[PDB]
Amino acid sequence: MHVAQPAVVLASSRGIASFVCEYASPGKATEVRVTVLRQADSQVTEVCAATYMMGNELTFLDDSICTGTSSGNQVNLTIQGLRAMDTGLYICKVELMYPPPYYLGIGNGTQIYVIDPE
Template sequence: MITLIITLISLWPQAGRALQVFQPYRTVGRGGEAVLRCSYELSSGMEELHLTLYRGQYEKQQMCASTFNINQSYFKAQGMVECRGEISANGVNLTVTGLKGADTDLYFCALEVLFPPPYLLRVGNGTIVYIEEEPDCPAHAEKIVADPEDTSKEAYIIPLILFAFVVIIIIIIAVINNIINMKHRRKVVGVLPVASKKLDCRFGYENFL
C-alpha cells in the first residue's frame, strides 16, 4: 500500500503535465514552399518548448529545429531547409521553404518541454507533404494557361504553311514541265517535211514530182 502511494505521488507531476501533438494527414506545397500545422495540447505552466521537424518514416532526417517560448508569436529556424513558425495558443504553423518535388515525403513534428521540468517529448502522427514539380519553362507554361486559344492557332498555322509550301512546289514543277513541252513542240514544228523521192526507170534519174 505504501509502495503504491509513493508511486502515485511520483507520477502525479507527470499526470498534471499532459502533452499531445497532432498533425494533418496531408498538405500540398507550391513554389518550393509548404505550410505544416503542428497542433499540440499543453498543460498550464509549460513555458519553453523545442520543436524539431523530421523527414522520413523509418530513417528520420532532421530538417530544422528551434527553441521558443509560448509567449512568442514568431520564430525562425535554419537547417537543411528554412522554417518559419507562427505560434498560437494550440499549435505552430510551420512554413518550410526550399523544397523540391523530390522532397515529397512523410514529415513529423517532435515537441519537447524544456522548462519547467520534468522533461517531456512527444512526436506527432506525421503529415504527407506533397511538393508540386515546377515546369522547366514557367513563362511558356503560364502563357499556355493564360491564352489556350493561341496554342490552338499555332497548331493550325504550321500544317497550313506546310500545305502551301507543297502546293507551290507542285505549281513550279508543272510550269517547268509546261515550258519543256512547249520547247519540244516548237522544235518539231520547225522541221521541214522531206519530199518522197521516186526513181523513174525510163530515164534513170530521180523524179521529184
C-alpha cells in the same frame, strides 16, 4: 503527450508547404522546442528546430528552410524551397523543456507532396 497535425498537405508551384502542429500542454510550460523530422526510405532527417517561449515569438536554430509563428499552445510551420525528391513524411516532434517535468510528443506526421514545374 498528444500532438495533432494535418495528415496530408500539397506544396505550391514555388515549393512552399505550411501546416499547423498543436500539442496538449499538461503543465504550465514556458520553453517548448518544436523539431521537424523528415522520415523517408527508412531513415530520419532533422529538417529544422525552433524554441517557443510562451510570451514571445518563435525562433529557429540558425539557418534552415523552415519559418513560422506561434499562437498559444500550437505553431504554424512553413517549409520553403521544396522539390519533387523532398516528398516524404514530415513528423512534428514537440518537447516541453522548461520548467520541469520534461514531456515528449511525436505526431503521426504530415505527408508533404511536391512536384517540379516546367
